Design a protein around this ligand. Structure first.
Ligand SMILES: NC(=O)c1ccc[n+]([C@@H]2O[C@H](COP(=O)([O-])OP(=O)(O)OC[C@H]3O[C@@H](n4cnc5c(N)ncnc54)[C@H](O)[C@@H]3O)[C@@H](O)[C@H]2O)c1
Length: 334
């Protein structure tokens, strides 16, 4: 099982870091036109959130990472990356700019077998969330797939647990989200979300997100039952889902906590997690879970109307899931 990374940004780099921990997948090639091999090595080695790389990085051609050659490309066009020549079977598409089947499928010209878009698609490319719907993937039906967003990977396991046990009548989500690369250090033009181009470090910034409605595709039972928005805040990493939902059957916070705990310790092992501790966002830097239920941050109006809080490391948790999905895709054939 081999991986090619297109876009060696926050996600692309953390995807590589994930694989280096992993014994069943190897990164064999990187493409990023906006960084030469020297710059690539540096951005791998040093991370403002996730620390010094654990292991070795040197420049050869190409990178030498933990003693193994990783082929390096700088092409604008995905059609042009020789994935097949490099021996790269799966492409992690993490540029943020090729989020359709049309665009992402061009990786197949270079001889890749499969492509995982590291974002929700602008089209109807199927979205998979590990531990929720990933086994619905049929290798004979799709070559380009999406891993959804960080926010969807946080909400979907939570939604599934809550829907299955109690039934969600209606739900509205806010995600309070750490800043990302699309934001700006000072007020300037976006490309060109006017709010997102306001000085990122001193603002609370409302944003649109499709994450909650996306849960309605991932879990078709919840189609039309969920929507949401995001609030961007100055912190460098880690985000939180605030889910306000009406339930079809009564449930106390305690009963919801047990349903979470059941799934965390069984079917959603490693995907859903939980805590009753006085946690804050930085406590989840490096967390590999998709969704961490915060018991003591939740509040109920009554037995039917509830506000649930779940954490996610939007960089690290999502990147692990993308690696999980790639390992899953490989095990299914091609
Ligand atoms: N960072 C997060 O919290 C997060 C979480 C989940 C999903 N995502 C999604 O993952 C994708 C990337 O996110 P990010 O935060 O890493 O962004 P980023 O800006 O850090 O990374 C994007 C990388 O792609 C490179 N790139 C641009 N054009 C390219 C091209 N034509 N060919 C190859 N590489 C190119 C850029 O140089 C950059 O290194 C986006 O779809 C984003 O929405 C981000």
């Amino acid at each position: 099982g081999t991986l090619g990374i297109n876009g060696f940004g926050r996600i692309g780099r953390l995807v590589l870091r994930a694989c280096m921990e992993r014994n069943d997948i190897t990164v064999v090639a990187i493409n990023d036109p906006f960084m030469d091999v020297e710059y690539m090595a540096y951005l791998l080695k040093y991370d403002s959130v996730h620390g010094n790389f654990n292991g070795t990085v040197e420049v050869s051609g190409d990178l030498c990472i933990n003693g193994k050659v990783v082929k390096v490309f700088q092409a604008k066009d995905p059609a042009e990356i020789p994935w097949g020549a490099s021996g790269a079977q799966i492409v992690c598409e993490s540029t943020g700019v090729f989020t359709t089947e049309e665009k992402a499928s061009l990786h197949l010209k270079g001889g890749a077998k499969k492509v995982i878009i590291s974002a929700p698609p602008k089209d109807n490319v199927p979205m998979y969330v590990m531990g929720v719907n990933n086994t619905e993937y049929d290798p004979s039906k799709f070559n380009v797939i999406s891993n959804a967003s960080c926010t969807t990977n946080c909400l979907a396991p939570l939604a599934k647990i809550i829907n299955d046990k109690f039934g969600i009548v209606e739900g509205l989500m806010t995600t309070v989200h750490s800043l990302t690369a699309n934001q700006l250090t000072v007020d300037g033009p976006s490309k060109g979300d006017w709010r997102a181009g306001r000085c990122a470090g001193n603002n609370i910034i409302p944003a649109s997100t499709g994450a909650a409605k996306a849960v309605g595709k991932v879990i078709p039972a919840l189609n039309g039952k969920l929507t949401g928005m995001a609030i961007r805040v100055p912190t460098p990493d880690v985000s939180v889902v605030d889910l306000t939902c009406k339930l079809a059957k009564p449930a106390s916070i305690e009963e919801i906590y047990q349903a979470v705990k059941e799934a965390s310790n069984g079917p959603m092992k490693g995907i859903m997690g939980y805590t009753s501790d006085d946690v804050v966002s930085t406590d989840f830097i490096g967390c590999k879970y998709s969704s961490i239920f915060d018991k003591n941050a939740c509040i109920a109006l009554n037995d039917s109307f509830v506000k649930l809080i779940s954490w996610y490391d939007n960089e690290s948790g999502y990147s692990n899931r993308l690696v999980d999905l790639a390992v899953y895709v490989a095990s299914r054939g091609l």
